């Protein structure tokens, strides 16, 4: 898959988000910009997660 995403996903999970729900947003975010860094990916996901 993608290093940046798996990283971003695990972190989101640690922060207490539904594992599955986190992956979907992270992955789509990744689709918008494949070269994103795990930090920006996480924050950018942090504001789309319930």
């Amino acid at each position: 898959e993608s290093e940046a995403a798996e990283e971003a996903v695990m972190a989101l999970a640690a922060l207490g988000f539904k594992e599955a729900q986190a992956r979907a947003v992270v992955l789509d975010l990744l689709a918008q910009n494949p070269k994103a860094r795990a930090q920006d990916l996480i924050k950018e996901a942090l504001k789309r997660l319930r």
Binding site: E7, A11, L46
Partner: protein, 315 residues
């Protein structure tokens, strides 16, 4: 009804605190840019959050506001610390002593090196990912300094207490708050409200509402000592600040129940009402006035409580 103080000078009372803040303030307002993390102890309704906006103003930064209960999971906080804030801003947290253990554990690093470290997976890997956060000043507050905050206390640079306001100050509020709403009221009038306000700014504004509500519903020229007194009289508030249900409470704990250890439960339903309520709302003041002392049995009224109502001291 949407305007409050902005400059610290415009902030009423707390003179003791204003001097100390003014120092710590103008310092960082000159050095780098962030004010040290401030933890405010003190009773409710004293205007902590307003001090939050004021300080924010003094620095020329914005203010994010949240409560402990709200941060239901570290994420809730990471979201605020990573996106909600901008270099310099202040995040104020009310009831900060009810932060989820985890949540608090993630906060320490945030305050220290302005970074949040998240631990990925586990095992020998136990790798951690960090969220670079903006420099910010955390301003927490506890409706009860009573040790319920962890060692998170050691992460706070400043740590002060807001005190109850003298009725003159509370009055100074109603006063320079009415001119804002045009409303005509005379000094003493406001000051008569002060006396009734339980030393806390919250009740004052509230009471002034009620009083101005009942008032002008008959005239429009001016609220003077008399006008004020009659209004208060109508709503049923004695010089001591107790309300309609306040007397009724310590009342049913004398005639209906002998002046002896009644017992919360045996009092709530006893006079149709809830304990938590008649304990987390009415008992506080009644106690701070020495008219209802809690005993390791139930509830007991005091020789003063009887007096305020006009009964002879029974042995």
């Amino acid at each position: 009804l949407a305007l409050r103080p902005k400059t610290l000078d415009e902030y009423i009372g707390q003179e003791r605190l204003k001097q100390k803040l003014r120092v710590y303030l103008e310092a960082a307002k000159a050095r780098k840019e962030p004010l040290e993390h401030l933890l405010l102890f003190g009773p409710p309704g004293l205007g902590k959050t307003t001090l939050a906006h004021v300080i924010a103003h003094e620095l020329g930064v914005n203010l994010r506001v949240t409560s402990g209960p709200a941060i239901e999971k570290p994420g809730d906080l990471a979201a605020i610390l990573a996106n909600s804030l901008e270099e310099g801003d202040i995040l104020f947290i009310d009831e900060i002593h009810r932060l989820s253990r985890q949540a608090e554990e993630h906060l320490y690093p945030a305050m220290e090196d302005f970074v949040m470290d998240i631990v990925i997976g586990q095992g020998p890997a136990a790798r951690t990912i960090r969220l670079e956060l903006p420099r910010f000043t955390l301003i927490g507050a506890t409706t009860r300094p009573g040790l319920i905050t962890a060692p998170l206390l050691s992460r706070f640079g400043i740590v002060e207490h807001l005190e109850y306001y003298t009725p003159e100050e509370l009055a100074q509020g109603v006063m320079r708050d009415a001119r804002l709403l045009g409303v005509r009221i005379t000094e003493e009038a406001a000051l008569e409200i002060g006396r009734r306000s339980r030393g806390t700014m919250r009740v004052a504004k509230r009471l002034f509402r009620r009083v101005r509500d009942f008032a002008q519903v008959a005239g429009e020229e001016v609220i003077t000592r008399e006008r004020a007194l009659e209004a208060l009289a109508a709503l049923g508030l004695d010089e001591l600040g107790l309300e309609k249900r306040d007397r009724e409470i310590l009342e049913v704990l004398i005639l209906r129940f002998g002046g002896g250890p009644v017992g919360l439960a045996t009092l709530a339903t006893a006079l149709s009402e809830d304990p938590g309520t008649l304990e987390e709302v009415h008992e506080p003041y009644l106690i701070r006035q020495g008219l209802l002392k809690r005993t390791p049995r139930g509830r007991v009224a005091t020789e003063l409580a009887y007096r305020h109502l006009g009964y002879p001291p029974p042995v």
